[PDB]
């Protein structure tokens, strides 16, 4: 018998991104080839199969720093982190290969899907 | 130049609610007349003016337990906590007064708005 407020989920995400901007209650640093990105473990888990596996592990859930594979591109990661917190993906000819490789590693299937479609269209 | 994945925000909220169900990375207990509710501080802050003020305070941000005013109804709080994590509000004739009073205390304006409208319609 519930009623639903259409904008609620987007408003929550907007506020989570504002907390990230303001570095409020961020609880992990993701290190990508020495570039560092502060984030909230719960948002990362909610968006990525890799982070869901990492932060549900009984030892890794307590880590304050996570180092990604050295082959991961920091710009690709930055673009995906922004997508996690905003639903908007800054996909460009110059970054699509890195974004797709990063999304495959992070296990973000919808992103991998749109990257494949954009690449196939340019062939 | 971004593209946007329409369902992303709702999918993130669905996953945050799954973490809450499974008590994964919950970091606060809200006590309402001895009833206890586990939650994520970031979701509470993202949904409520009261929790935003509490968890941005330099001392209160570190508390693992928050006690609400004794006049707050635990069922009203439970209904609002479910709304925070799902966008669905279980508003019924038997709970609307408690839900509205709780939403006013929690500073959730959209909820206070729909409660006022539903009450005005029954007058």
């Amino acid at each position: 018998s519930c009623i639903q407020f259409t904008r609620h989920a987007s408003d929550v995400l907007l506020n989570l991104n504002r907390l990230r901007s303001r570095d409020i209650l961020t609880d992990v640093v993701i290190v990508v080839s020495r570039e560092q990105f502060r984030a909230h473990k719960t948002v990362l888990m909610a968006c990525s199969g890799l982070f869901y596996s990492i932060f549900t592990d009984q030892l890794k859930c307590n880590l304050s720093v996570i180092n990604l594979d050295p082959e991961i591109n920091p710009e690709g990661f930055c673009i995906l982190l922004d997508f996690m917190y905003t639903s908007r993906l800054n996909l460009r000819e110059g970054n699509i290969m890195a974004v797709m490789a990063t999304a495959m590693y992070l296990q973000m299937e919808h992103v991998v899907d749109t990257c494949r479609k954009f690449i196939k269209a340019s062939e | 130049s971004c593209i946007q994945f329409t369902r992303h925000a709702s999918d993130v909220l669905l996953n945050l609610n799954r973490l809450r169900s499974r008590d994964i990375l919950t970091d606060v207990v809200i006590v309402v007349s001895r009833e206890q509710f586990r939650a994520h501080k970031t979701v509470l802050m993202a949904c409520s003016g009261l929790f935003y003020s509490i968890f941005t305070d330099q001392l209160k941000c570190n508390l693992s337990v928050i006690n609400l005013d004794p006049e707050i109804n635990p069922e009203g709080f439970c209904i609002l906590l479910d709304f925070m994590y799902t966008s669905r509000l279980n508003l019924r004739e038997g709970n609307i007064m408690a839900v509205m009073a709780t939403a006013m205390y929690l500073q959730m304006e959209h909820v206070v708005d729909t409660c006022r409208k539903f009450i005005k319609a029954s007058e």
Partner: peptide, 5 residues
């Protein structure tokens, strides 16, 4: 906003 889901 509010709707019947």
């Amino acid at each position: 906003a509010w709707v019947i889901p």
